[PDB]
Design a protein around this ligand. Structure first.
Ligand SMILES: [Cl-]
Ligand SMILES: [Cl-]
Ligand SMILES: [Mg+2]
Ligand SMILES: [Mg+2]
Lengths: 183, 183
């Protein structure tokens, strides 16, 4: 059926210009591949606070991915992941913002560091949540587990750990192998 | 998993140059949208006889549909669909020709007239068969009924009827709404 997918990307102080660009490229690639499908998209940059770069209505109005993200500016601040996730659940997934009523909700969280805040993401528990942890900040198994709480279960399918930002290209390659025209 | 898909397109005398071109456009549109996935394609033109325009190996070596179908010459003869389907079953789905051993076999038959031969397609029965009947030759319930024996069950799912070749543009729009990234 319909799929309303939200990209919640890390814009923290740790990211180098090229790394931030690779995150933007990844989001665009998936969007272009899935253009003219039953998917609709929204994008929110998060660091200390949260900013919807374009919401569902924006995408519907102008499907152009490159145009939708041409205005993004790297925040360069903290990594308040609990707040960011709750922000999507209540401020982005809204009918008035273009979200479709009984559409399946999906969240693709991309981050390069552990969350600097805490609390709960209970309000977002019914959204299908994928998280992509990139870079040396996720070298240890300990740091990787910290991401499970944000993603759906099992972690084996929903939590993806990438050692480099270059690997985002590999991940896109792999996701395309999972694309099918369903009966 | 892996999907080996063969397009079997009508090259009969009834087809005008632009109608035959729209059939090719449909095939290329499909292939382009499904590029870099688990799908691999082969295309066979049929009329009085049959011709593999490019096989699975060719597709793999040069994944460019436009380049893959640039030499196609409209046969302009009859409509031997029974023989054509049997040819795909035994002359196209072959490992030496690029087909992957246990990939799901799918056949997309595109035609604008009733078969001019007879027999059976028992040898192609394990292949998921879709048939697209286009135009004035299918304006009666009887003519449309004859297409059923070539496709998988139920006909309501595997038989597609288009009043015009223009409609192949519509059909492609429709099928894209069924494109999802599987878990
Ligand atoms: Cl950081
Ligand atoms: Cl004909
Ligand atoms: Mg960071
Ligand atoms: Mg014909």
């Amino acid at each position: 059926g319909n799929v309303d997918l939200v990209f919640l990307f890390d814009g923290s102080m740790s990211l180098q210009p090229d790394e931030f660009q690779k995150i933007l490229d990844f989001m665009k690639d998936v969007m272009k591949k899935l253009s003219n499908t039953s998917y609709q998209f929204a994008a929110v940059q998060f660091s200390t606070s949260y900013k919807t770069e374009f919401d569902f209505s924006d995408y519907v109005k102008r499907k152009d991915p490159d145009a939708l993200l041409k205005h993004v500016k790297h925040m360069l601040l903290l990594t308040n992941t609990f707040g960011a996730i709750n922000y999507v659940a209540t401020e982005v997934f809204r009918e008035e913002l273009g979200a479709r009523p009984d559409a399946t909700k999906v969240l693709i969280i991309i981050t390069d560091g552990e969350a600097t805040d805490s609390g709960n993401i209970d309000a977002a528990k019914d959204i299908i949540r994928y998280i992509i942890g990139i870079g040396k900040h996720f070298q240890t198994k300990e740091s990787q587990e910290t991401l499970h709480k944000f993603a759906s279960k099992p972690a084996s399918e929903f939590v993806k750990i990438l050692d480099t930002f270059e690997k985002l290209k590999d991940l896109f390659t792999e996701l395309q192998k999972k694309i099918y025209v369903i009966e």
